[PDB]
Amino acid sequence: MKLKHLDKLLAHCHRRRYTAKSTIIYAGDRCETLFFIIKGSVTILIEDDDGREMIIGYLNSGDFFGELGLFEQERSAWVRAKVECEVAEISYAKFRELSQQDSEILYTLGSQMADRLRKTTRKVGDLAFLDVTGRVARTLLDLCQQPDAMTHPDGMQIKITRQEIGRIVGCSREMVGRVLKSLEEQGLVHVKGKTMVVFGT
Amino acid sequence: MKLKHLDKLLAHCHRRRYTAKSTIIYAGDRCETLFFIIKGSVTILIEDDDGREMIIGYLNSGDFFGELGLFEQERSAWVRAKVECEVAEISYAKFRELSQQDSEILYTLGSQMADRLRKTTRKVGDLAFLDVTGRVARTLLDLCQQPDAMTHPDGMQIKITRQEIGRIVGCSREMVGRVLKSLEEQGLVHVKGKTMVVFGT
Numbered sequence: 001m002k003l004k005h006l007d008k009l010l011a012h013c014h015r016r017r018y019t020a021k022s023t024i025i026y027a028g029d030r031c032e033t034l035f036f037i038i039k040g041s042v043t044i045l046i047e048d049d050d051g052r053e054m055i056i057g058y059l060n061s062g063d064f065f066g067e068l069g070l071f072e073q074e075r076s077a078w079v080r081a082k083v084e085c086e087v088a089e090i091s092y093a094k095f096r097e098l099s100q101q102d103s104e105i106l107y108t109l110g111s112q113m114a115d116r117l118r119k120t121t122r123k124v125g126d127l128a129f130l131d132v133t134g135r136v137a138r139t140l141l142d143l144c145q146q147p148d149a150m151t152h153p154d155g156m157q158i159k160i161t162r163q164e165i166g167r168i169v170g171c172s173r174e175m176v177g178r179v180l181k182s183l184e185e186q187g188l189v190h191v192k193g194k195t196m197v198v199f200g201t
Numbered sequence: 202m203k204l205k206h207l208d209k210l211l212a213h214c215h216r217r218r219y220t221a222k223s224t225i226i227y228a229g230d231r232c233e234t235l236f237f238i239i240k241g242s243v244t245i246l247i248e249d250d251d252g253r254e255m256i257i258g259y260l261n262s263g264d265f266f267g268e269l270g271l272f273e274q275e276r277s278a279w280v281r282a283k284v285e286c287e288v289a290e291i292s293y294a295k296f297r298e299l300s301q302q303d304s305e306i307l308y309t310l311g312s313q314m315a316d317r318l319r320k321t322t323r324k325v326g327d328l329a330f331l332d333v334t335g336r337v338a339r340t341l342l343d344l345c346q347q348p349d350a351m352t353h354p355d356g357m358q359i360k361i362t363r364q365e366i367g368r369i370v371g372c373s374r375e376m377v378g379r380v381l382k383s384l385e386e387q388g389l390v391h392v393k394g395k396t397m398v399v400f401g402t
């Protein structure tokens with residue numbers, strides 16, 4: 001996508017700011033538009049009738065979301081604002097148009113979906129083949145690649161909670177605390193508050 | 202996609218017939234082309250160093266596969282022929298071209314990726330929230346929607362093995378056999394050889 005394409009999209013949308021934790025998309029709702037993250041981050045969640053939530057992933061500035069109902073549908077997952085979000089909502093009708101005039105816009109959307117299919121297919125493998133300790137270790141490493149990951153002399157540090165890790169791997173916060181106690185005893189990470197340093201990464 | 206688009210794709214490719222069980226794509230290989238299923242079915246697999254394989258899904262006639270390395274990469278998963286396959290291989294270079302001339306071709310690819318993201322996200326939820334009995338029941342129902350699913354007076358019948366179900370849900374064939382014994386005792390299905398009837402569906 002080129003700056004000229006962004007310009008157009010931003011010229012044909014409804015802007016919206018979302019405060020952290022606010023729900024942008026409700027699973028089940030009818031799809032009618034798609035979004036583009038101008039600034040900030042969002043969380044993709046799925047959950048069982050039980051209330052247990054699972055974080056499928058995070059999307060950041062420059063990403064599109066709410067695009068799965070385009071080609072056809074009802075919202076396939078929950079999209080919640082991780083941090084304050086400047087978001088641009090664009091109708092499916094207006095999007096298919098801007099895309100016919102400029103194919104690179106669709107190509108970029110296709111690129112993002114492709115990236116997500118890979119990520120999600122790896123998540124399937126994680127849930128299928130790895131134990132919790134394994135998954136937690138994998139999640140923390142992945143989290144060190146997020147844009148909110150901070151740099152550190154001894155590696156990388158991140159702001160994260162046990163609950164968030166549990167949502168990502170699929171286990172209680174209690175078990176996460178246990179895995180961390182072990183990882184720390186092994187000196188693989190060092191936890192301190194909502195902050196955590198992961199050495200050598 | 203329109204018949205005219207298919208015509209073009211088939212005019213700019215390398216045809217190949219694959220016999221059932223043959224590997225069409227090897228995970229890890231460098232991506233250079235994408236495929237279009239003219240006739241038949243393929244299986245998407247992932248696996249751990251252990252040799253345990255997991256069936257991520259099945260694609261049928263009219264589907265594209267090997268498309269994740271397009272927008273950018275190395276093959277993200279294994280693609281194996283479920284049954285005899287007439288396949289059309291098209292280079293990424295030639296595909297991006299046919300797509301610029303005709304955007305509907307890319308739109309159809311985008312539609313398929315979207316469908317797969319949903320399917321796979323549901324698989325994540327399955328592996329995250331459901332027990333084996335639950336997943337097996339869900340898999341059998343999904344299998345009743347495949348094009349090879351046969352019709353039946355009392356419902357639907359399918360050709361399937363315990364090993365295949367295990368690959369799909371993520372458990373040994375032994376456990377699958379156990380779940381089936383229970384499902385059958387409950388008269389929810391009736392197994393007979395490699396054939397299995399699922400009542401009321």
Ligand SMILES: Nc1ncnc2c1ncn2[C@@H]1O[C@@H]2COP(=O)(O)O[C@H]2[C@H]1O
Nearest residue numbers: 065066067068069075076077116120322
């Ligand atoms: N596995 C996934 N990875 C990344 N984003 C996803 C995943 N599953 C769903 N999403 C999305 O969250 C949105 C929910 O609304 P849609 O179904 O219309 O479109 C969806 C995507 O943008």
Ligand SMILES: Nc1ncnc2c1ncn2[C@@H]1O[C@@H]2COP(=O)(O)O[C@H]2[C@H]1O
Nearest residue numbers: 051052053163166167170171172173329
């Ligand atoms: N299989 C699971 N078992 C336990 N918690 C889970 C599972 N899948 C997701 N979770 C969750 O992720 C959260 C971690 O924090 P909690 O333990 O307070 O609550 C948890 C749920 O919402």
Ligand SMILES: Nc1ncnc2c1ncn2[C@@H]1O[C@@H]2COP(=O)(O)O[C@H]2[C@H]1O
Nearest residue numbers: 121266267268269270276277278317321
């Ligand atoms: N979750 C999935 N669902 C359906 N097809 C998939 C999934 N993950 C991978 N595939 C694919 O199998 C192919 C492996 O090669 P590619 O990575 O280039 O492109 C891939 C897709 O066509």
Ligand SMILES: Nc1ncnc2c1ncn2[C@@H]1O[C@@H]2COP(=O)(O)O[C@H]2[C@H]1O
Nearest residue numbers: 128252253254364367368371372373374
């Ligand atoms: N977590 C798992 N546990 C046991 N088998 C698994 C798992 N994930 C996949 N499988 C598999 O699916 C197959 C079912 O047949 P097998 O039991 O002979 O061999 C199995 C593996 O290849």
